[PDB]
Amino acid sequence: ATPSLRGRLARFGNPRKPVLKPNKPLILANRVGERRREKGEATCITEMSVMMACWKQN
Amino acid sequence: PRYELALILKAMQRPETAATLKRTIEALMDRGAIVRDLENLGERALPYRISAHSQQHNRGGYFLVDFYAPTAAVESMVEHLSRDIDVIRGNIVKHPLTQELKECEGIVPVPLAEKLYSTKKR
Amino acid sequence: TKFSIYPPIPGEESSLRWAGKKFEEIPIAHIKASHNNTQIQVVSASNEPLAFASCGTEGFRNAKKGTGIAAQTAGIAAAARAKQKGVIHIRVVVKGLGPGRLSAMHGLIMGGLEVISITDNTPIPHXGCRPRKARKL
Amino acid sequence: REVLQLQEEVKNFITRENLEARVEAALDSRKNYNWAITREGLVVRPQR
Amino acid sequence: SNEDLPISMENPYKEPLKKCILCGKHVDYKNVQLLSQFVSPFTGCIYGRHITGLCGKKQKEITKAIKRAQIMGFMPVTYKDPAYLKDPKVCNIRYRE
Amino acid sequence: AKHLKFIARTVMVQEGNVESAYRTLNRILTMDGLIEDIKHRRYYEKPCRRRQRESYERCRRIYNMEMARKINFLMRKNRADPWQGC
Amino acid sequence: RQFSYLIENMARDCGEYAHTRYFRGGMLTNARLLFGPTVRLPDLIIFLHTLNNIFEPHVAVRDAAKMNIPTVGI
Amino acid sequence: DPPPSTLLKDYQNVPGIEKVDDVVKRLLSLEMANKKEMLKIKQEQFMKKIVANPEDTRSLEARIIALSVKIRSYEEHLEKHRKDKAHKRYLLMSIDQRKKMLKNLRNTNYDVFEKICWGLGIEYTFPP
Amino acid sequence: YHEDRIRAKFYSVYGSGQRAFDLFNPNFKSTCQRFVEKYTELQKLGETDEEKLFVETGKALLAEGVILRRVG
RNA sequence: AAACUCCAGUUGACACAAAAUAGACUACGAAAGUGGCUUUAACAUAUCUGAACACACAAUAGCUAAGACCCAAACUGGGAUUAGAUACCCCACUAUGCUUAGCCCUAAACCUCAACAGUUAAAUCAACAAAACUGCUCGCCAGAACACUACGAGCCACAGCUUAAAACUCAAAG
Ligand SMILES: NC(=O)c1ccc[n+]([C@@H]2O[C@H](COP(=O)([O-])OP(=O)(O)OC[C@H]3O[C@@H](n4cnc5c(N)ncnc54)[C@H](O)[C@@H]3O)[C@@H](O)[C@H]2O)c1
Ligand code: FES
Ligand SMILES: [K+]
Ligand SMILES: [K+]
Ligand SMILES: [Mg+2]
Ligand SMILES: [Mg+2]
Ligand SMILES: [Mg+2]
Ligand SMILES: [Mg+2]
Ligand SMILES: [Mg+2]
Ligand SMILES: [Mg+2]
Ligand SMILES: [Mg+2]
Ligand SMILES: [Mg+2]
Ligand SMILES: [Mg+2]
Ligand SMILES: [Mg+2]
Ligand SMILES: [Mg+2]
Ligand SMILES: [Mg+2]
Ligand SMILES: [Mg+2]
Ligand SMILES: [Mg+2]
Ligand SMILES: [Mg+2]
Ligand SMILES: [Mg+2]
Ligand SMILES: [Mg+2]
């Protein structure tokens, strides 16, 4: 269920203080955000640590 | 008005619990209160450890006291409960039955807000 | 029956036994994954210290101290000492959201300690002290 | 009607004469305020 | 004139207004079993109205009763009482999935 | 501190599947909002900044839910073109 | 796009013309520059669907009003 | 103030309440009640004493009495809570409204106006 | 219309009829419509009680053989 | 790097500080503000408008006296960076944030959109923003800068607050 919007913004008929202060109009656009690439990180650190540990011992 | 006292007595024996209950009710009567009824919620482990009167309590006995007292006696009874060493916790609240329940017809739907922005073409 | 993710509360008469020991008898492994260090201490059910390891104790210094590889190295060392003193199963209690929060448990598993439960005990004030001011980076 | 209903309830109030009896009766008896609710909206009493 | 013209009437097919599960039932701070149904079993946080499904009034009463019970020693704060974990589930939330 | 131990935020490991147990616990914390609260509690956020953040999140939630509802509404029209060539 | 085939068949049978495809800009207000200097504009336009595919009024009715072409529209 | 044993205004006219148990009498008296019940009784006494036709409540003579009771209650509250700025504003506005009602009543009757002034002890002072 | 009360009542009690609506036929008559017509006919006769009028309409359909499967 | 090393981890005892979730709620108050629990007192006006100066309030910061120490932190000291760094980064510690009694009367005190009653009609409508108007009343405004300034006057304020100009300059300012 979508949160209510009545009595939230500042208008000429709203007596109460504005609950929400949007910097952009609350109007649906004709597009969606582009897919975000995943910030990859290091891989096989566990295997690298095991190999280096055995190098230290040997 | 009508107040209800929630009391958490220490996990003592039956004679000690009876004496503590008698002392507590007598203190209410001495402060001009009409004790309507006495209830026994039972003995149970406290949800959290309570340290009061230099004692660490893990189990206690929950009791309820319903009474009618003047508005100038609640504070005196609270002070008496604090000085009592056999009371782990004690709170005096307005009786829930005093406040009636207003009739509810249903969950009225909330219409979606409209005309929040002008109709000029952006 | 169905596996119970809920812990076997001592009030409940749970039949789960690990090597003849109940849930309340399994030694605890306290992991504190700070933003710059991961300190691991293994203590018995009666609050008796058994092992202790951290990034500084393993040789990592400054920024190197406080990484995932440093955390798992401390876990391996702590598990090794614990197993020498007779620890097999551990109840893991993690306190903090810093780096090496999971690597420390991985190091303990690689050391040879079996984890039977994971508990988060991160201190969350309920409206408490006032933290330091924000950074202007 | 409220006054008449209150008139009968006074007979069951705790006084300084029956205080010991009420305390003993309370210690013997038990009271439970717990009850659970369901998705259908039904009160499930704790049958113990 | 003509009797086939539509008349002025209220909607007869209108369904009754939906009611919350706690509608018409008293909420008491001593009812720990009822209060425990609206808290997180792992953290003890009070669920929002979007999860509980209660109305505005009942959500407020549940919140006040929980806070009163916790401060007076009737209800645990940091976790849900294990004895009430087998009570019927009335919240729309899934943790394992 | 004064509560019982190993009852809060505890997840049991099944068949040694520690990864699943950790993911389940992390998901539980994230859904309850503890993870985000801890991250924001590292530094003190001034009340004016906190109100602005809450207003931004509430506006973002409303827009996202409305956009999601429209997408689910229009997803029925994802079928192939009926009147191809027109 | 559901009755384009039917409407084009109707135009063939009655001997009149039809336009059920995408309406390129300037087909009426700039017809001389596209069809030819001596092109003859229609004397009547019949709309069976006054709305385009974005649920908005078609541009042909506005163009017909500009060019003083009477319109019969559903 | 009315005696604490005085019954509430709601129960002061019910038949059979004059012959009940002492517990019932003190339950329905002013002793086990809030301050609002005492104010209602004080308003009732002033209405009976000063003005006629107590049924009317929109009369300018009853509005002054009701506001005067509120003024006294605010003064009693401020006697203990001297740092209550909100109630201090409420008391001042109530005084100003009462003076405005007195001015209208003086221009309207000047006979019941004198009846109100002596009954409630209020003195009408011309502003500077 | 006046019959909208009857249709709403028959859609609540006795539920929807087994017969599927055939909106293509201009002279289609559903079970609910037949119940409405019988209710109207008995109203033309002049029965006073609305509850008795509803029950008598159900009795007439049972006599005619119309299947009346209540939801409850 | 500096600092601590009277340090760090578990457990137990353990506030005169601040009140996770509820809160996807939109309530109370004239405004400032107000969101842990209980109790008491309590939330002006039967037309509206009506005071920067009358009266009563007024976030944070600041002052005068008496108390409290968890944390944060102007100033200060040290470490680091830099050509310089009196800042941004790290550490430590004050005034201060708390309570009680008085003071000062400030804010981008703004939702920069006055109070009361009413309308959706056509030219609705410079632009943007939160669409355009009617009736009545109070306050204010009329080129920029000088100027949240000088002087005068009032104030428990004495490096202060309120009111508040002029000469000179420009054809712009917005
Ligand atoms: N100042 C008086 O004694 C007085 C007497 C009758 C009416 N008024 C009314 O006061 C308003 C202000 O008049 P102005 O422009 O000459 O004053 P102003 O606003 O220039 O203020 C100068 C003086 O008038 C006082 N004043 C201001 N507003 C007042 C008010 N509403 N009531 C009483 N005194 C006020 C101030 O305290 C100061 O002494 C007007 O509406 C006027 O009709 C004032
Ligand atoms: S719908 Fe009745 S109390 Fe919520
Ligand atoms: K809190
Ligand atoms: K603003
Ligand atoms: Mg903006
Ligand atoms: Mg050094
Ligand atoms: Mg919150
Ligand atoms: Mg006025
Ligand atoms: Mg003036
Ligand atoms: Mg101030
Ligand atoms: Mg101060
Ligand atoms: Mg500090
Ligand atoms: Mg200090
Ligand atoms: Mg005080
Ligand atoms: Mg403000
Ligand atoms: Mg302004
Ligand atoms: Mg005004
Ligand atoms: Mg200034
Ligand atoms: Mg000045
Ligand atoms: Mg001058
Ligand atoms: Mg001067």
Side-chain angles (χ1 to χ4, degrees), chain E residues 44-62:
Chain E
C45 307
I46 303 173
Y47 287 154
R49 63 182 57 194
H50 64 283
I51 296 178
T52 64
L54 307 176
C55 64
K57 179 177 57 181
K58 286 305 173 181
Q59 184 70 20
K60 180 66 62 178
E61 293 186 1
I62 286 297

Side-chain angles (χ1 to χ4, degrees), chain H residues 21-34:
Chain H
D21 192 5
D22 303 0
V23 176
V24 185
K25 293 191 301 180
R26 64 177 304 180
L27 282 178
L28 306 178
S29 62
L30 286 179
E31 178 175 350
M32 299 184 177
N34 48 18

Side-chain angles (χ1 to χ4, degrees), chain E residues 13-53:
Chain E
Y13 308 96
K14 175 186 176 181
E15 299 179 1
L17 304 177
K18 295 186 177 181
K19 298 184 179 182
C20 54
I21 56 182
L22 291 181
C23 177
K25 298 179 181 58
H26 178 47
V27 176
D28 201 328
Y29 70 100
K30 297 163 298 183
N31 192 344
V32 190
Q33 181 174 0
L34 174 61
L35 296 182
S36 299
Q37 289 182 311
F38 303 96
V39 297
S40 179
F42 303 93
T43 63
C45 307
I46 303 173
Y47 287 154
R49 63 182 57 194
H50 64 283
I51 296 178
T52 64

Side-chain angles (χ1 to χ4, degrees), chain C residues 57-77:
Chain C
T57 56
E58 299 306 316
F60 300 92
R61 297 294 179 267
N62 301 332
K64 295 86 183 179
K65 164 187 178 182
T67 57
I69 175 178
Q72 65 183 25
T73 301
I76 293 178

Side-chain angles (χ1 to χ4, degrees), chain C residues 2-3 8 26 28 32 42 48 75 77 80 82 106 108-109 114 118 124 128 131:
Chain C
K2 176 185 178 181
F3 183 83
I26 295 299
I28 316 173
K32 184 176 180 299
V42 181
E48 300 178 1
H106 288 172
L108 293 174
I109 297 176
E114 303 178 1
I118 306 181
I124 304 178

Side-chain angles (χ1 to χ4, degrees), chain B residues 4-6 8 39 41 44 46-48 50 62 64 89 91 93-94 96-97 101-109, chain E residues 17-20 23-26 28-30 32 53 55 57 61 68-77 79 81:
Chain B
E4 184 183 18
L5 166 60
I8 304 179
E39 300 183 8
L41 298 182
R44 43 160 293 189
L46 301 179
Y48 39 73
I50 303 181
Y62 289 74
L64 294 178
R89 289 291 181 85
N91 296 267
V93 302
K94 296 184 298 300
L97 297 184
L101 301 179
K102 188 174 182 179
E103 304 177 0
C104 182
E105 300 178 357
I107 304 177
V108 286
Chain E
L17 304 177
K18 295 186 177 181
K19 298 184 179 182
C20 54
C23 177
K25 298 179 181 58
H26 178 47
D28 201 328
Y29 70 100
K30 297 163 298 183
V32 190
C55 64
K57 179 177 57 181
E61 293 186 1
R68 174 180 294 187
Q70 290 174 350
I71 197 61
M72 294 184 181
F74 282 82
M75 183 180 183
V77 180
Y79 58 88
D81 199 317

Side-chain angles (χ1 to χ4, degrees), chain A residues 1 3-4 6-8 10-12 14-19 21 25:
Chain A
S4 179
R6 177 179 49 84
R8 299 295 196 273
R11 294 297 180 270
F12 273 150
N14 193 24
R16 61 185 64 90
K17 56 183 61 180
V19 181
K21 304 173 181 179

